[model samples]
Target chain A: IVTQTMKGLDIQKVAGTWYSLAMAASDISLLDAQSAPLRVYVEELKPTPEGDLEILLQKWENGECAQKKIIAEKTKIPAVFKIDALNENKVLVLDTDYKKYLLFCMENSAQSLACQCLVRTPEVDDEALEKFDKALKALPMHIRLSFNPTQLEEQCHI
Target chain B: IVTQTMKGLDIQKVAGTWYSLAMAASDISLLDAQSAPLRVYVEELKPTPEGDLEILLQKWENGECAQKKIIAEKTKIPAVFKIDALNENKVLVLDTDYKKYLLFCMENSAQSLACQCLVRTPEVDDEALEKFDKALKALPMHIRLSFNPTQLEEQCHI
Candidate 1:
């Protein structure tokens, strides 16, 4: 019998704020980009009993800025990092709608989107970091952003 | 390039008030133990860009009937006729979730379901009925009442 049950990745666990990292278009080089990382905040985590998670999203207009709690959801695992960027920030922002992170690029303005990547909230461990690194490889270079967002909204008010 | 420009069915035109219908169980029919029809008024319509349409459902209960809206998406057609037995009263609903009209036979008291037949809505001329019927054959019958408290707050204050 085809029953209603949770299948595939459960997104509720990683449903909060995240900060984007700057890596080469190709994940071959790391800790190379000089600019600050971009931050992203999420709100209204609406989850179904079946386990799929959906959230309201907002972006940080600047580098390193903090934001307030906007409203959100829960559920999780202790380890296991999953870096899922289909291509450049353009593709990340335009295509792969990961309810967990944001994309940023330097050469490309926020309007263009080049080298920024927000890591979903919660401290990242070595395992998650390695997974993230493996995930970041496979993109190009030549970008320009020198900083990330500074002013973040209060964490609970969106 | 897979872009966000991929548009979905126009939901704005379909979001509004609609009359709904439902069916009972039956042994005379191959579909159920007993079968009959029921009708209910739909108080509201909400359609999502992601191809989800739900009705703000209402019906009579005890002497002072209470009402609730449910996410009635997986109907026979993009729209379908559904019935449920609640607190001794039969709750009937409708949908065009599959882009056509499909009918369902459900006995909530017994938690049982059976596909009834296809019922055409207003736009059946261009073979809309065919589409609706095809959609209903695509899913099972179920429902959940929505109890959104801040609906008025979410509305624009004119």
Candidate 2:
């Protein structure tokens, strides 16, 4: 099934730390393992005057945490972006509440797709998870996986 | 749990088409999916004069069949190979009978590990699959999944 990106998204509203609540992918490799660098810890997002979006991400590198930046150039269409330094990756703020949760979809050039559930805080409420559940329905028949940010937060803290 | 690679493996005897019979992974997303590049169709493996191995694979691309080649370089250790053009992937010919079946393990750069059981024929027998079952004992915690290559062969014919 096909899905649509969030319409008239305000880049400012999406700015802040977001913990990955869960992720599902058509090619689970993108989300399942580090074989591909697609799976990531989204740290923050900032908007530029040119209407571009700059994303800060926490990633695994050489078995340690690494921070990476991705600048997404804005298109005429709102909430859709073409990621620089990433392969034909189109980022969509598929839907979000701005306060509690965000749902994202990335359609790669290879035709593989992955969706993520993100929350403002490490502690998740059931309401936030249900939005992610609704997003997965658009791309049914894919493997799903999730992790605990609280546990990871503790590891990175020490 | 730890597993061992084939002792003093002869790469020559491994030169032929092999079909995946079963797969194992902690997430098992690669194995259980409708399809994945890693849950593959291995067409040919040939040893290079330098002792590196040339692997030819068959894949579905743009609704058509495509052939791709990946050259695996020989490492100092026997039966262990460093795959070319990938993120520090180490491949091991875990075990093989040289005729009936072969087992493989791919340890990705991300600390993610995946195992595969392959056979010379599309039709799998209980005896052949038993070897994979034995291999899985070391990594028994991971989920397991298998495919029917006989059905795949038929699909190719049609």
Off by over 4 Å in 1: A1-158, B1-13, B26-41, B73-111, B114-158
> Measured with DockQ on alpha carbons, how good is candidate 1?
0.01
Model 1 agreement with the true structure over B50-131: per-residue lDDT tens digits: 5555657444444433466665443333333233334322222333443343333333333343332222232222253333
- Model 2 chain B — which ten-residue stretch has the worst lDDT? B149-158
Q: Scored by CA lDDT, what does every candidate get?
A: 0.32, 0.69
- After superposition, the stretches of candidate 2 with alpha carbons farther than 4 Å from their true spots are A152-158, B1-158
lDDT by residue (A1-158, candidate 1, tens digit) is 00111234344444454543222332211221122132233334444454444445444334432443322222252111212233222112211234544332222212222333345543322343334333433333212111122312334111
Query: By summed lDDT, which 10 consecutive residues of candidate 1 chain B come out lowest?
Result: B27-36
Candidate achieving the largest TM-score = 2
Tens-place lDDT per residue, model 2, A1-158, is 33667887887778878777666776534654543456677777788877898888776667776778888888887878888564677888888888988888877754678777888887755687667766665663234555554443642211
The docking quality of candidate 2, as DockQ, is 0.04
Predicted complexes: DockQ each: 0.01, 0.04
Clashing pairs in 2: none
| Candidate 2, residue A17: how far the Cα is off, in Å | 1.3
